[PDB]
């Protein structure tokens, strides 16, 4: 059993490692840094970047061992600029920035309202209403274009879509972000979210002491972005709280996540509002970029697009129109979302701090070490996925359940997987049902679109789609 120090490594100097990382690859290509590192060191390595050292793994078999020894209250890497903002400006923290018993308490509360089948079944008509309106927007744009046809970059529209969707299941109220004339304050919120992520990157491998010193301007801009996030989340929650007392009726119809938490949960109001803030901010840039990638992948692979349409048409007929029923009848659609997140993870890595010592690849890794699963590098790895550059949803249907062992990692694992996983799955699946029924998707002068690291992974450049009424 080899000691920790024997794990392949660029070296022990974190600032030198950081220097070589910045000059050769760059901060916005961290996902490539991982790929190259694995090609250089083999299937496991350690790297100190600035002050933080991680062990990095790629093999689903090492992944399984990692998540096997996970404790009751797991911890992932905390993003230093995010943590500092919350501490210094004393903002209430949600489930994302809590650990141990305080994390569990929020998570358990939130799980009853956000992850539980009994609760999540209520999301269906709320998300469908938004998706149906998105389809209307595009139909309007086709009519207006006068060519039976619409071409355009719909990123901003996908951000507005994702925002209507998360706000609708939380508040049970439409924000009108899919209308022709849009709330400019709600837009200012949507933009702050992207700014928060983008401005995170120059500060990523530095202790807070070095932020204000070498990234003063970035820190300033980062703080302004979180201020918008928090201001408007507070206003939303607070208005909701008072309007509840103004209309005070024990409604029998479903009204949204917030109503349920405020009316019957163990959480304090301040805890609730902290988590409303995080769920809102978490929901805008994640589902939107993933859908964009999906549409891109359907445009790149027209046969696969044809198959998915046929599945959804069959499913709408077989279910005689009912959405709840449809969702149990689209296994290829669900697999295609899994296939989209493999090629295009939102999260470059998953991370866990070990609670106990652990052996991986005959190396001894001591308790409290950060271990990172290189999710991006994994999905591109030709030894772990057959023909990895090919978008093939059937891959997830294979009854050879050796082929999918610890491969579906886009939303993470165990008790501290994505909190918004059901919202995201349901929102994207419903979004794609509606699109597939209404439009054929193409990209004129199609080319390979790469990935940039903006804390979340995002496309490197715009994608201009063409839509045809089906």
């Amino acid at each position: 059993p080899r000691p920790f120090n024997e794990i392949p490594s660029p070296g022990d100097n974190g600032w030198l490692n950081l220097y070589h990382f910045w000059r050769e690859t760059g901060t916005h290509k961290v996902h490539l840094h991982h790929v190259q590192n694995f090609q250089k060191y083999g299937p496991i390595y350690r790297e100190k970047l600035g002050n933080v050292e991680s062990v990095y793994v790629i093999d689903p078999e090492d992944v399984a061992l990692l998540f096997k020894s996970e404790g009751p209250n797991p911890e992932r890497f905390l993003i230093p600029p995010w943590v500092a903002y919350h501490q210094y400006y004393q903002r209430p923290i949600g489930v994302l920035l809590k650990k141990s018993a305080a994390w569990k308490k929020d998570r358990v509360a939130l799980n009853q309202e956000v992850m539980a089948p009994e609760a999540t079944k209520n999301f269906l008509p709320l998300l469908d209403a938004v998706s149906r309106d998105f389809v209307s927007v595009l139909h309007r744009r086709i009519k207006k274009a006068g060519s039976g046809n619409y071409s355009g970059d719909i990123s901003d529209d996908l951000f507005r879509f994702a925002f209507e969707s998360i706000t609708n299941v939380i508040f049970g109220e439409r924000q009108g972000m899919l209308e022709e004339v849009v709330n400019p304050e709600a837009q200012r919120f949507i933009d702050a979210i992207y700014q928060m992520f983008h401005t995170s990157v120059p500060m990523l491998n530095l202790p807070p002491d070095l932020f204000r010193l070498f990234r003063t301007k970035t820190w300033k801009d980062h703080v302004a972005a979180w201020d918008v996030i928090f201001s408007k989340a507070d206003i939303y929650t607070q208005n909701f709280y008072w309007e509840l007392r103004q209309k005070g009726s024990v409604h029998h119809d479903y009204r949204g996540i917030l109503y349920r938490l405020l009316g019957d949960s163990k959480m304090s109001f301040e805890d609730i509002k902290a988590n409303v803030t995080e769920m809102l901010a978490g929901g805008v840039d994640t589902t939107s970029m993933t859908l964009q990638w999906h549409l891109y992948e359907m445009a790149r692979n027209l046969k696969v697009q044809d198959m998915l349409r046929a599945e959804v048409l069959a499913a709408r007929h077989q279910a005689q129109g009912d959405m709840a029923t449809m969702l149990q009848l689209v296994p290829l659609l669900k697999a295609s979302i899994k296939e989209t997140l493999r090629l295009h993870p939102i999260s470059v890595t998953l991370q866990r701090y070990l609670v106990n010592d652990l052996v991986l690849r005959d190396y001894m890794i001591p308790a409290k070490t950060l271990v990172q699963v290189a999710i991006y590098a994994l999905g591109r790895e030709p030894t772990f996925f057959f023909d990895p550059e090919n978008f093939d949803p059937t891959r997830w249907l294979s009854k050879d359940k050796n082929i999918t062992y610890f491969r579906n990692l886009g939303f993470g694992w165990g008790v501290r997987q994505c909190l918004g996983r059901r919202i995201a799955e349901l929102e994207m699946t419903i979004f794609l049902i509606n699109m597939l029924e209404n439009f054929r998707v193409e990209i004129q002068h199609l080319s390979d679109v790469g990935t940039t690291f903006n804390l979340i992974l995002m496309p490197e450049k715009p994608i201009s789609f063409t839509f045809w009424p089906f």
């Binding site: 009751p72 358990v108 992850m115 539980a116 296994p331 579906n408 165990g414 008790v415």
Partner: peptide
């Protein structure tokens, strides 16, 4: 056992059940 508490948000014990299983339920 039952760490997420009967919510289908772990695997310490449908299409979503299938996903929790390919990483190895009692509460469903």
């Amino acid at each position: 056992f039952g760490a997420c508490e009967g919510t289908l948000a772990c695997s310490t014990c449908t299409d979503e059940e299938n996903d929790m299983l390919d990483l190895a339920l009692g509460c469903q």
